[PDB]
């Protein structure tokens, strides 16, 4: 009982932003560091980092989409 956040392989974002730009697609590996999305959070473009090492198994954000803090961003395998 309780939906809206990341945890189950999600990347949570760290605030609420918007989306502006994806890096990473279905098929890509990520590494924990590289740039995976940029957030626009009040007017600032804010670097989304992966939290582990990993391939983007799907996308739960896309371009001109607002994403809440906590939400899964991006799925990780």
């Known amino acids: ?3 809206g956040k ?5 990347i949570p974002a760290p605030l609420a932003g918007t989306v502006s730009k994806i890096l990473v697609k279905e098929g890509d590996t990520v590494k ?9 959070a009040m007017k600032m473009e804010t670097e989304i980092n992966a939290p582990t090492d990993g391939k983007v198994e799907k996308v739960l954000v896309k371009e001109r989409d607002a994403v809440q803090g906590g939400q899964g ?5």
């Open 6 to 10: 990341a945890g189950e392989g999600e």
């Open 1 to 3: 009982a309780g939906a």
């Open 73 to 77: 961003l991006i799925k990780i395998g």
């Open 32 to 40: 924990a560091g590289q740039t995976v999305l940029v957030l626009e």
